[PDB]
Design a protein around this nucleic acid. Structure first.
Ligand SMILES: [Mg+2]
Ligand SMILES: [Mg+2]
Ligand SMILES: [Mg+2]
Ligand SMILES: [Mg+2]
Ligand SMILES: [Mg+2]
Ligand SMILES: [Mg+2]
Ligand SMILES: [Mg+2]
Ligand SMILES: [Mg+2]
Ligand SMILES: [Mg+2]
Ligand SMILES: [Mg+2]
Ligand SMILES: [Mg+2]
Ligand SMILES: [Mg+2]
Ligand SMILES: [Mg+2]
Ligand SMILES: [Mg+2]
Ligand SMILES: [Mg+2]
Ligand SMILES: [Mg+2]
Ligand SMILES: [Mg+2]
Ligand SMILES: [Mg+2]
Ligand SMILES: [Mg+2]
Lengths: 195, 246, 191, 139
RNA sequence: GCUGCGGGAUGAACCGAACGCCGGGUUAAGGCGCCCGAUGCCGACGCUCAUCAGACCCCAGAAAAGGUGUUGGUUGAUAUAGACAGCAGGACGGUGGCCAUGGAAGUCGGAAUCCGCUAAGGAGUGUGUAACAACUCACCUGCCGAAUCAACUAGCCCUGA
RNA sequence: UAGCGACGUCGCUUUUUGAUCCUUCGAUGUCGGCUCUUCCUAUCAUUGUGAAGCAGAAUUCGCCAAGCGUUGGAUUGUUC
RNA sequence: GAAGCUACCAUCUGUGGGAUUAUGACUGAACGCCUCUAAGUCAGAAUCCCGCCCAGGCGGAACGAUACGGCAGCGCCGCGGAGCCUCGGUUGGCCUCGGAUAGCCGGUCCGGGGUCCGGUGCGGAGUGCCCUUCGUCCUGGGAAACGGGGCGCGGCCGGAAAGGCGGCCGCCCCCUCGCCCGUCACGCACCGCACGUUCGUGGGGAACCUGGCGCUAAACCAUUCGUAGACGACCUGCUUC
């Protein structure tokens, strides 16, 4: 069904390639925490290329023409637009299936977030190469919503800690229950058949 | 907008604002909402909204309107305004607003003399005027066939379009414009109750000291007979007579 | 050429203590404490010696610029040890032209206020770093002493002072005027 | 940090390649990428294998530098790598993965019914223990 | 031209390959991150940071020249008869040499170019005062301690742009 | 070698002119001026800087830099 | 010469934050020294972006009124029955920031340090959970003192970024098979065959008979208006005081 992807520590083109391949098959994929998607290269170069992309505009009418989004979710959505056949009613359905969110919505606070190993910064970059933050780029050029998103992110991180302490307490209780007795008759069978 | 909580006693001028045809309407606005005010069980579901308003909101804007019966106009419809209270914490802003629901706000309470306060409004209505009157371009000379008040060249050949910066026949006026940094001279009350039987005492400074009113000799041209609080602004202010300004 | 390990050796005296939680180095001593992060380098930082305090800065294969980087850690650890044992004192004599330079301090020595400034009427204010204390020296004309713990903070504040005092739109071969860093040293002498 | 380095005389697992699931012993490093390996009792012939192809372990041996197969075998059987390697949790994990790969349908049915019974008894005990925790916290 | 088809995104001439309508298999030219079929190989070896990276014959952009930015290569020179650096000390006598003249007294110039003390001083590498003077260098020595320096060459990248 | 730079030599651009005839001859209305929009930098001035044979003033040579300005007239149909 | 339009021909106003280029620097190796750079920091401007200012998207909010009359019509809950159209799945996984020259778990002491486990991760997505359950009847061994479902009832809000299921107390009609192993007999055994099994009391529209609780309006034209008008459009008035 849905594929809730974390966006922290992923590279833009790698994650866009994997999302654009998995969205043409029908798996409804949603990339959350889009402000944390890293981009390799120097951050000055990345904002210089994005400034050149802003400089690209129609001169006879700027409204009828290139629409330059500043929000990082819409940056990733344009990145996947440039890779899907969006002029056809296959890539149009794929863009309808794709959803993207800066920050985290409440149902994606509820559900578990996946992490793609092939798109990671650590996997795809030598650790002495420079990088960038898409949220830093978006706040530096246009997207004026870094502080509100960071405040709500710290709020949901505190919520995640106060849920995780309860979950870890329940896991300590169930391992006390596993430490208790009168369960081993099935457990010998399970150890002999892959506990 | 999280949620909007109105007051109880809503005036007929606000009801004329909420309706289009006041004659054809049966005047049925806010009957169930006033029933929610009257019900004691509805008060607990109404004060729960303010307890949620203290917790989840940061920007509180208060709706206010004008009394049209104190004007020489003919409109008789109020004008609703969200006014962002820039006070302290949300709790005491909400307490201030609930304390001052259904109450009047003078000009001396917020504004003051010698204050530099901007004006927002809509320009005059000049209509669908031409190019030399809209963009103030130079006229063509007398010998020009097919026009004198025109832009003579629009674009080059190789852009086979018309650029958006080219001066063309746009409608002049009735545009939203704001002008910044205008000083207030005098905020003065007028026409107080009959202890003194009718006090005029306006535009009567420390050096004038004579009986005089707000209005000029013969009333204001196309406005009327101002008998209320009034702001005495500097320079030229955007708009015609009888026009709503913020 | 992918050189196998390069290690730097640091001896730490008994007057101070060191604690590393990874690539973060926290040094505690008599003149306060000082902590820094080496997160962006990826060089192993190990210590040894039961109350002997022998630090080793060890880097494996790497490149030539990274073998250059592995000595920078040893040098900044030496600078932190010197700053936590002795501290840093920078003496700045006001090399002044016909117009003098009147220097006062306002907020606990953290706000240096400069006046008469090459004859300019504009009174200049310089806010210093969190953790550096400045003072006006005694028994010496127009000397400005900057004392602190972190060499980067102290020398960046002194750089802000010597760039705030700058001759503009003239010749700077003539008009040799400004507050320049005269002497670099430690607070506690004879060590 | 860095508990294990490559060394003359260290046993190492092989994860990738045609010798997968087999132990070797690193004799010497050739140049930065490949190392000559040898296995006397692990059914692998003396050859050169890459470091990213192999997998480092925690047990060490005492080899001379570039020793013969006889001395490799004698140091192996003196160190007793096979019984001590069976007596670790790592080989138990790999063996359990092999057993899960070698399951059949009747075995999965038995695993599933034992799984239901275990998880039901564990869930009832967790409910009883949190009931006892509430009974303790009620005064 | 008279000629489709697969690649070169798009193309008259480029590379394959020439055409009756179809099924199966295979391949050339090309390609295998997504459009867009196919490397989603636990691919191998190295090079490259570029604030204007680069990305495949014709084909759609660039030179002479330069780089103590890294990577190899060649030819030499040094060094326990303790080098390169770093810090410190000395840097004279003949002689203010000889041609010159406003001065040349190592320092604008023309020629030349040796000796003693030597541990070492070059009839002198530069700075300066117009000269005479002060400073530094060649050279020698004090501490440290074992590797170091110079000139070319071509691969990437940069400046030239 | 601040600023210059011969004898030689390597380039860039199409704001001049030249060369060719590829499209246009069942027509793309062929100079200049007026009005008006937009773009480039090889920068005249302004903002921030480096160097002078930069004492100050005034200049000259470079860098980031095209955001904003870059006139009124006598002459000539003039481009100039 | 009124009103009205108009003149730099009268008059008023035109507003600041950030990252940075050039450049100057700090610490600092490479290269014992030096060095603005190789990692890392500082200042830094008519350039850039945003604020302010304009029009607001096949963009989304909060609230009001939500059709009497004499029949009528329309909402919310729970309904039993039939029919047309459209397209997709055949279990859902209810969540710790972070790191890769480091990191997980458990735990005396004053969020932190010492100590104890595990680590090519088994407190593991090469994973976990109800699950490979077709059902029923009879009788036995383990586990089960919570029961286990809800048309449920009263309370709490958790949850504000786009919220609706989950947890606690007390009752309600029952279950002591809500489960694992053994015995017995049956249900369509449709006689070799496909689209079968699923969140489906799937999405919305037009109507059919019934219970309970409620609702009794508003736009557009016409007329007037001038603060606006080419026409449309926009701001306006209308009561029997
Ligand atoms: Mg008009
Ligand atoms: Mg004519
Ligand atoms: Mg000057
Ligand atoms: Mg032929
Ligand atoms: Mg083709
Ligand atoms: Mg091509
Ligand atoms: Mg075929
Ligand atoms: Mg091929
Ligand atoms: Mg594919
Ligand atoms: Mg061509
Ligand atoms: Mg080279
Ligand atoms: Mg280039
Ligand atoms: Mg021709
Ligand atoms: Mg021609
Ligand atoms: Mg034609
Ligand atoms: Mg034409
Ligand atoms: Mg024609
Ligand atoms: Mg411009
Ligand atoms: Mg710099």
């Amino acid at each position: 069904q849905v594929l809730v992807l974390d966006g922290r520590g992923h590279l833009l083109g790698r994650l866009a390639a994997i999302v654009a391949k998995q969205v043409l098959l029908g798996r409804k994929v949603v990339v959350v925490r889009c402000e944390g998607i890293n981009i390799s290269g120097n951050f000055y170069r990345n904002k210089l290329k994005y400034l050149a992309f802003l400089r690209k505009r129609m001169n006879t009418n700027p409204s009828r023409g290139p629409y330059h989004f500043r929000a990082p979710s819409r940056i990733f959505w344009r990145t996947v637009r440039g890779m899907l056949p969006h002029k056809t009613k296959r890539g149009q359905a794929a863009l309808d299936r794709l959803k993207v969110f800066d920050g985290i919505p409440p149902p994606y606070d509820k559900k578990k977030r996946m992490v793609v190993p092939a798109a990671l910064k650590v996997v795809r970059l030598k650790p002495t190469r420079k990088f960038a933050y898409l949220g830093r780029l978006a706040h530096e050029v246009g997207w004026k919503y870094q502080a509100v998103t960071a405040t709500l992110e710290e709020k949901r991180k505190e919520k995640a800690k106060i849920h995780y302490r309860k979950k870890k307490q329940l896991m300590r209780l169930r391992k006390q229950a596993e430490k208790n007795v009168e369960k081993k008759i099935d457990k010998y069978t399970e150890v002999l058949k892959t506990h | 907008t999280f949620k909007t909580v109105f007051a109880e006693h809503i005036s007929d001028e606000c009801k004329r604002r909420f309706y289009k045809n006041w004659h054809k309407s049966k005047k049925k606005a806010f009957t169930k909402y006033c029933k929610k005010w009257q019900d004691e069980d509805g008060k607990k579901q109404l004060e729960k909204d303010f307890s949620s308003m203290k917790k989840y909101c940061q920007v509180i804007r208060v709706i206010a309107h004008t009394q049209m019966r104190l004007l020489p106009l003919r409109q008789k419809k109020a004008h609703l305004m969200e006014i962002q209270v820039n006070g302290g914490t949300v709790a005491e802003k909400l307490d201030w607003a609930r304390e001052r629901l259904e109450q009047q706000v003078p000009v001396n309470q917020v504004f003051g003399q010698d204050e530099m306060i901007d004006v927002i409004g809509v320009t005059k209505g000049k209509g669908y005027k031409g190019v030399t009157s809209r963009w103030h371009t130079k006229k063509l000379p007398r010998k020009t066939h097919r026009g004198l008040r025109k832009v003579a060249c629009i674009g080059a050949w190789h852009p086979a379009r018309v650029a958006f910066s080219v001066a063309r026949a746009g409608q002049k006026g009735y545009h939203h414009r704001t002008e910044i940094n205008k000083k207030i001279y005098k905020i003065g009350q007028g026409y107080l109750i009959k202890d003194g039987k009718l006090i005029k005492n306006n535009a009567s400074t420390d050096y004038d000291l004579s009986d005089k009113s707000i209005n000029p000799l013969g009333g204001f041209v196309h406005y009327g007979e101002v008998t209320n609080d009034f702001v005495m602004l500097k320079g030229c202010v955007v708009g015609t007579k009888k026009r709503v300004l913020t | 050429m992918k050189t196998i390990l390069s290690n730097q050796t640091v001896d730490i005296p008994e007057n101070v203590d060191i604690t590393l939680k990874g690539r973060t180095v926290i040094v505690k001593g008599p003149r306060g404490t000082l902590r820094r992060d080496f997160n962006h380098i990826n060089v192993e930082l190990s210590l040894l010696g039961k109350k002997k305090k022998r630090l080793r800065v060890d880097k494996w294969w790497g490149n030539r610029k990274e073998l250059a980087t592995v000595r920078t850690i040893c040098s900044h650890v030496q600078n932190m040890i010197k700053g936590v044992t002795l501290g840093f004192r920078y003496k700045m004599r006001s090399v002044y032209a016909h117009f003098p330079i009147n220097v006062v301090i306002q907020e606990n020595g953290s706000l240096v206020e400069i006046r008469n400034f090459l004859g300019e009427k504009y009174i200049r204010r310089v806010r210093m770093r969190p953790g550096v204390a400045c003072s006006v020296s005694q028994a010496q004309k127009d000397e400005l002493i900057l004392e602190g713990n972190d060499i980067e903070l102290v020398s960046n504040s002194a750089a802000l002072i010597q760039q705030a005092t700058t001759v503009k739109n003239k010749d700077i071969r003539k008009f040799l005027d400004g507050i320049y860093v005269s002497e670099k040293g430690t607070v506690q002498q004879a060590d | 940090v860095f508990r294990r380095f490559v060394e003359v005389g260290r046993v190492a697992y092989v994860s990738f390649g045609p010798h997968a699931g087999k132990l070797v012993a690193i004799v010497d490093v050739i140049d930065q990428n490949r190392a000559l390996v040898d296995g006397p009792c692990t059914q692998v012939r003396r050859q050169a294998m890459p470091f990213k192809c192999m997998q480092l372990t925690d047990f060490i041996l005492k080899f001379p530098h570039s020793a013969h197969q006889k001395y490799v075998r004698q140091a192996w059987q003196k160190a007793d790598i096979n019984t001590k390697w069976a007596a670790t949790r790592w080989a138990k994990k790999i063996e359990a993965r092999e057993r899960k790969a070698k399951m059949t349908d009747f075995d999965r049915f038995k695993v599933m019914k034992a799984k239901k019974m275990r998880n039901r008894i564990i869930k009832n005990e967790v409910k009883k223990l949190q009931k006892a925790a509430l009974l303790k916290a009620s005064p």
